[PDB]
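Q: Hi! First time asking for a complex rather than a single chain. Here are the components, and I think there are nine in total. Is that enough to go on?
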Amino acid sequence: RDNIQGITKPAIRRLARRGGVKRISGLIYEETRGVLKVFLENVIRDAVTYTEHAKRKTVTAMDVVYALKRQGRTLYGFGG
Amino acid sequence: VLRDNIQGITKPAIRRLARRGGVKRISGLIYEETRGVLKVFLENVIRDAVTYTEHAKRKTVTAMDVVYALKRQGRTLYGFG
Amino acid sequence: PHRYRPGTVALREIRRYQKSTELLIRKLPFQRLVREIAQDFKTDLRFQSSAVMALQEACEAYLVGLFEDTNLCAIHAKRVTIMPKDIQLARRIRGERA
Amino acid sequence: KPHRYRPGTVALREIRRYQKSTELLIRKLPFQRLVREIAQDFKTDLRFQSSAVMALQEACEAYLVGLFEDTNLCAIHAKRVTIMPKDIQLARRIRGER
Amino acid sequence: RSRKESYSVYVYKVLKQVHPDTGISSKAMGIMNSFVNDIFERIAGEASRLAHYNKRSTITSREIQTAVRLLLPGELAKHAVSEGTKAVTKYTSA
Amino acid sequence: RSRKESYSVYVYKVLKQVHPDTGISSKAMGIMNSFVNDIFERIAGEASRLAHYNKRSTITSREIQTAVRLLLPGELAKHAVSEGTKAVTKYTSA
Amino acid sequence: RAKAKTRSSRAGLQFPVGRVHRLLRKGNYSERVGAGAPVYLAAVLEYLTAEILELAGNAARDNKKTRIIPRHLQLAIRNDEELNKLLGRVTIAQGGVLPNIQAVLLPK
Amino acid sequence: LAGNAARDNKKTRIIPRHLQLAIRNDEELNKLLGRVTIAQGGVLPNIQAVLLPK
DNA sequence: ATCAATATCCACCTGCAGATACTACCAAAAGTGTATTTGGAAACTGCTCCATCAAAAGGCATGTTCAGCTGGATTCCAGCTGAACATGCCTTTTGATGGAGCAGTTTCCAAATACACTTTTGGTAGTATCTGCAGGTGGATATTGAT
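A: Yes, that's all I need. Here is the structure of the assembled complex.
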């Protein structure tokens, strides 16, 4: 279950181009995959905590918004 | 009134603060730079502190006002209440 | 045949992707990754579509910010190539590793 | 013919000395005058407790020490041992203060 | 019969005031709702803290004024303070 | 001339439990008071938020448990949860 | 009885004073709430909304469009010092970034 | 943790330095209290490897 | 400077998803009036600690000299990253189906609050008391730098 190679190398290069980067080493891709997986599990842990506290089975957008806000990464647009 | 006291933060004091931070060699242009930084920091806290003091209609700044300002800037401080 | 010099298409892509607002990761792979990660905290969870959309928006914003910081750390050392040690320095200074 | 330590020896010795201790590193009276001057620029005829100025001193010293550590990291990144103002600026920019 | 209150119509009134002939999409309106809610919670939390520090049991106009001063910077703080003061005097004098 | 409550004696009891013959200074005791107050406010604020999200009007043991899980990491969260659960069962069964 | 002229009209505002009063009561912020607190808060909120909307509308009319989208809100926020410093830690969905390339990366 | 630190430095009474040494040396405590300043605490003895001689 | 080849930008067209009105209505949400309580503003006062002074004395800061070592520039080279093609795999759309799980309704019952006494217990002042610890002394130890 390599769903982490779902984040292809051209995708990471696009993300880098948006950040203004002009040249990319060949060892950068594994590093960004690790960073992204860390961030994602950090957020999803608290989202699932918020969910199971309310005795639900469906993760809602508000649970993700709260989990993000508690990390100090407020997100506008999904508050409905 | 009092004016021009940022120079009371002497070069040896900054060198000591840098030694505690692990710094081995220090450029000659650092000192001036550092002073600026420090001033900004203080102005951000004292302002907040004074904003608390005038809210209670007091005239003396207490340690709790400083602790509240530091906390509201995300710099929590243990020891003074 | 016509060939651009190494670096021209790079700045063209930079301008193109800084003028745009789209998402840069494909949606189905990210969805699969999110479900696989959530598989370890609790089994048989369901996700609304807006939940995965929010997760994707947040992740892309995070990564773009990290790449800006990395580019600064690279330029500081008088390079133009970003290397893993630049990412490590940026994250160490932000406090994400420390 | 007189004894002289080579450059960098007393610096490491001072590093150990000042990392082993807990005292304050700025004189009390100059710092107090500075704080009073800034406060007077904010609101006239203020007073201060003693513990208030002590708290301000502790907080400011902690801030500067952390900043110097980040600056050292940025300097070492560039293959140097001498810290220079551009390192302070890079650290304060990555942190998010300027 | 479950409703869902929001600040859509008030944001639309303000927009028609400052830009008489420009419209707004639905996603931008959701962004504006999120913004209003966020700033409201910030100000209200700070005012509650201020009231607790002074052992007061009431939130008044002074708590809101001080919270505004503590939260907004410079230009924003000055103009918001002036606006709110004018509003309160207009309200009481009526 | 009004009294000033604190957690000094309870911290001293805990210390005499884990280290029977070690003492503590006054400044360290002030640090410990600050620590207890800070962590208490963190947990209580998070539990209040949790209660507001679910449109509940009561703070119960589940809110405290979830706040503990959301605030403490790994080892700390596990052991604190076990300790509090044991305390509550010991209390109700008495 | 008389005509029930409300409160937001009394204060000369567009935002609702009664709704803000109810939200201040129910939100568990204090055990009493004054009469001028909702008026003050409504005035401040209306001022901030009008500021950000004027900036966003100028951006939208600059890109030859008639209808504001989240990109215009992001361009308005990030281009102003005090707004960018008030909202420095928020993510706007479908906003993008600011066009900006370092000078050393350009050719020549 | 603080008492173990204090008994390590041949002392019988805990001071703020011992609290700082206990907090900064543990992962989960240092990550719970990562953004607090302890008055009269000092720092952790740590010198980069490149600054050492030879 | 030439120019040939690309990619970008501007004008025009248009079909369509999305903004805009409206009627309805309707639950609900705000405004009016009133009687009651209580929290907060006033006036007074007592004492705490904050600003001022001063004096002496030594510990820290300033300035100067000398040298060493580090940062910065120049050169060269190898290797690693970018640009272009050609496949071919995987994402996307969209159309439909079950179906499980979330949201609204009704009871009704266990749990939390308000109130009144009572015992205790934890906190402060005073006065007291050891005692661990900070500062000093001397000697041994370990490290550095020049041969």
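A: Chain A touches chain C through 49 residues (CB under 8 Å). Let me know if you'd like any chain examined more closely.
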